[PDB]
């Protein structure tokens with residue numbers, strides 16, 4: 383079990399860790415989060431009590447170092463940092479535990495929610511999408527644009543998702559215009575899966591990360607990417623049976639975890655009605671369709 | 683964006699552009715089979731691609747053989763149209779390729795755009811006008827070459843005959859759409875109107891009769907009256 387200690391909490395803030403969140407008051411004696419489950423990527427994220435504008439946060443893996451949070455009063459945000467002196471770090475963490483100034487990441491005997499949300503998400507891949515290689519954790523926020531968005535402006539602070547474009551030469555083979563555009567199997571299976579991602583797990587990992595960025599930060603371009611990766615599968619007549627089954631599982635938990643009040647901005651009516659009711663794979667997402675119809679029948 | 687009554691004069695500027703109309707590409711007769719069920723039988727069609735400034739018409743004849751063994755023919759028709767427009771463009775010398783293509787039905791945007799990915803600087807646009815180009819098969823000589831065709835065939839026409847010698851392309855386009863609107867709403871009356879006076883002939887190299895300036899004005903009035911009329915005969919007004 384791992385720890386992310388905080389030097390302090392000088393400003394009032396809502397802190398979130400994976401799918402859980404609490405409030406910390408301006409200068410309340412708070413020194414971090416404890417009992418964090420090793421073996422999965424995590425997200426600690428922040429919404430300031432004064433400025434709900436700019437949700438931000440840090441993807442990280444406790445196996446890849448000892449990380450702590452410290453408020454920076456020049457830049458005005460909680461910054462994630464790495465302590466290389468591990469002795470100093472164990473020493474500090476032990477003292478805050480003894481003084482009991484750390485909240486406990488909920489140990490929950492029945493819940494696999496987070497594992498199901500992050501099954502294929504891996505820190506090494508995250509850091510290809512969010513390029514900032516001197517750090518081992520990755521910063522994200524509400525406002526960061528994607529690489530495809532900057533094509534339609536600062537490249538350093540961008541989300542370098544895989545570019546998907548249904549009306550592109552990449553997507554459409556000469557001579558198969560009608561075929562490749564109505565049945566995108568070629569683009570999914572050979573261009574993307576064999577070409578760029580190499581396997582279904584890298585594909586799903588990017589889909590999962592995109593959804594979580596959208597959900598946790600309201601990052602519009604991540605939402606666009608999530609929905610695009612869904613649409614390509616759902617618009618391919620030939621998909622490995624095992625990808626379809628895992629996709630149905632992935633999406634099911636995404637839909638289950640979504641905040642009920644946010645469903646109107648984060649769910650694209652067209653893509654979902656297409657995927658669930660028109661596409662080749664309309665009959666293939668049984669768990670996803672059951673939950674969608676019982677929770678958001680309005681959108682359909 | 684879209685083409686409508688407000689940006690109407692753009693059609694007559696010096697930027698090359700083409701209208702594409704795909705309404706007559708897939709044509710059928712519906713009939714009863716011996717067993718009493720209904721069957722379609724397809725007949726030759728055509729793609730109507732027109733330069734509204736020059737009057738040049740690239741009439742691509744869609745021979746029925748291209749549907750043999752295909753399914754979902756209404757949808758293929760739109761993809762076949764785009765494939766043929768793209769081939770036409772690629773056949774034209776660069777300085778003759780269009781800078782915009784205007785599709786008269788929105789269902790053609792996606793098929794053409796996909797086929798034209800190699801031409802990112804050619805803008806594919808829709809229009810909000812209700813242009814009567816589907817009545818192009820009411821022009822006898824266009825109907826004649828489509829129905830006679832025995833293979834795929836491109837045939838080239840000037841849909842304005844020699845009008846441009848005496849009027850502008852704006853006026854020329856207005857006459858054509860009035861004529862095509864009239865033929866669409868009541869073909870027999872439209873055709874009667876055009877051919878009453880036997881002394882006015884259609885030249886072998888032309889599609890319409892060789893009216894004088896004065897005779898066109900009378901003609902155009904008769905087509906307006908017709909079009910107002912049939913509108914009454916239809917709505918009771």
Ligand SMILES: OCCN1CCN(Cc2ccc(F)cc2)CC1
Pocket residue numbers: 399402403404415485486487488
């Ligand atoms: O059903 C269990 C609900 N509990 C209570 C609400 N939560 C408070 C909390 C504590 C520590 C954190 F790291 C984040 C949130 C914990 C889950």
